[PDB]
Amino acid sequence: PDPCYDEHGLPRRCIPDFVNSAFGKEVKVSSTCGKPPSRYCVVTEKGEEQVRSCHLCNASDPKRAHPPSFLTDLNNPHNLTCWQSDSYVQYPHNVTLTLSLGKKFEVTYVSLQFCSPRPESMAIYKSMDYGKTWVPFQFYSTQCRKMYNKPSRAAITKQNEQEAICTDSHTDVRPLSGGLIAFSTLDGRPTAHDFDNSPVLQDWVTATDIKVTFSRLHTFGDENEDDSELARDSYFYAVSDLQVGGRCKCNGHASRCVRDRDDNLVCDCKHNTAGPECDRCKPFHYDRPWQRATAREANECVACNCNLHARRCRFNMELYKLSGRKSGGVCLNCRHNTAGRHCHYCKEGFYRDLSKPISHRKACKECDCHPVGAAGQTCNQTTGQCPCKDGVTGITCNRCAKGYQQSRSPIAPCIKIP
């Protein structure tokens, strides 16, 4: 059926599946070996000795070429997809990785599996928009204050839950190969248990781009020396899999994200909502403002009540809060000769045809006063009583009253009688 609705047809909060938003995605890096072709040294241990090896990184040979595509391809522990940068991009220089998702995702984690020694200092940034503004998100480094000007392992308080935490944890050389770095956005967040009812954390987890900056790099004594190896050296960055798990952000009003008219990813919004993340909500559904989907309530925009007359409408906060936070939408351009907040009364020049229901389109008969016996041509919108002149009476003014006699005058049709 539809996960956004129950078996009785009422709406319930729905959420897309959890996936790696980076699988198969293209990646943009500021470094990669191949142009020109160079060598790289890899130290592999065997019992106790080490003895480093040497290999060549061929830009053309698929069998010695490390393209950024290996970051988001199918990772296989028995046969890795290593991406290697250039040679000795040491501080202050830094290799940056930028991933564009083309859709607001609620990030749950960001993991980098390095087939070489993990970085001494890396930075993980996000983008709230679609690549214009970046925001700190996690930091790793042996000298937090010295390099990222962050205090080591800051205290996370409700006063500032979006703190970018720097840590000297996970920033160790060995394992010289296959080291992980996994950043969980909700770990240690004060209000992470009450996420649906914490907007600060919803903003904290939402992002459309992920930047990864590799600031410093681990080294040993081999740096100046003399045999520094001016053509390749063995210090470098290298990651075999880059994962960024999470969910497509739909504020709980979409079971799944689909492909746009222009191939862009967007929520298949339900509950009468619209917009890429089901933030706003469909036309004519503007009674009661838009809220996020919660486990307790579905909170879908409700349509305006216009007694089946007007089509457009529009939400009003004051009317909403002044009606007990129940109805705040007013109707627009009432058709069928009506008017008012809900198209509930007939406009001047017409009256309420009570014989027919207010929802009916003929619920507003015109005035139809009498050209001779009526003093005006604008009847009572409530009763349809035309203003009768002197001797004339009725609702349409087409007859004389008691003590008054009919006449052939257009001006004085009835006249009293003594």
Next chain:
Amino acid sequence: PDPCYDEHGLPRRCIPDFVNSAFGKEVKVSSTCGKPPSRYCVVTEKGEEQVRSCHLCNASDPKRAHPPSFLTDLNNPHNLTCWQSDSYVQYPHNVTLTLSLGKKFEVTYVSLQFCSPRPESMAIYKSMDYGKTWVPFQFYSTQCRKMYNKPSRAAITKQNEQEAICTDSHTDVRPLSGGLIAFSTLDGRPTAHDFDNSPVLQDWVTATDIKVTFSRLHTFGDEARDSYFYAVSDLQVGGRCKCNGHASRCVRDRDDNLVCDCKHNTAGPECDRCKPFHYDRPWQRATAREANECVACNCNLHARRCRFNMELYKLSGRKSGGVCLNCRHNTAGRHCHYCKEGFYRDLSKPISHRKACKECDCHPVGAAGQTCNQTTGQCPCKDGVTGITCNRCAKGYQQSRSPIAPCIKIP
């Protein structure tokens, strides 16, 4: 002071004095002795013999020149001033005397004094226009059928009271000097005792000019020295100036015309119509006990023109019938008594006041329409809005901003 209104100022029927409309006025003649000066001859009597004479008539000598002026001048039984015609003007020749009065009188009598012997056949005509059409008014002759083709001494039917009658009374030669012929406009006339309620007779006596035609002259003697002429001492047409009972004097106009001092809110030459805006009741001739005045229209000081509808008058019980035209001052109705659509009666001012009808000052937010009640001025309020102009929220309703929904009900 004015006889058209009593002490209380109530209008009572009034009439101009009874005068001789001929005195002074000039008569138009056709035959006057004097042209190539000739002579005549009057004849007297001595009991048996017919002693006659013969005198001269000059066209210049004051002491011998019988002019037409001698018909309407100061007349006295002594030193009598006589008009005379050229001698020998017997059948079928005519001697006419027209008199234009200038305005419609109600002729009462037509008198003639005859220095010569009275005529054998004479006729009195009149005009109710001004010399254009001339109708027969009385005939005098011995041979009526023969000459005027009128039945001698017929009867005045109520069906034809405007009938000229020929008669042989006053047609004798009896008085050679001083013959009187007088025509009473209402002799023989059936409804004469009810003149004041007899429109036929009122039309009959109305006349603007008068023509006396002399026809056959009495050859008296039977013996040349024929000398048979017409000679009238004084012509007296006595009557009142026709003002239909709404005037006490006739006076001279802004164009120098004899007309009526039309009172009783009437207008016109003979007070035959109502004055402007005094069209509430149909015009009638003043009666003794009635005075049928012209009554103005009550447009409560809001209209300049009035028009009369007889249908309205009759269904009104013969009361009013005047419909006002162009009700100004933002009013409408027969008598400009109610405020047209978009205005309302300000009952603080009086109906006659210019600002008796104010406008609709209906709040554009609190009102569902922009038309007052006209009687109350209240204007179509919407939902939780009260006030004549829909300017305030009601009880239990709270002000907002939204013009579509000004007031909203509280918890």
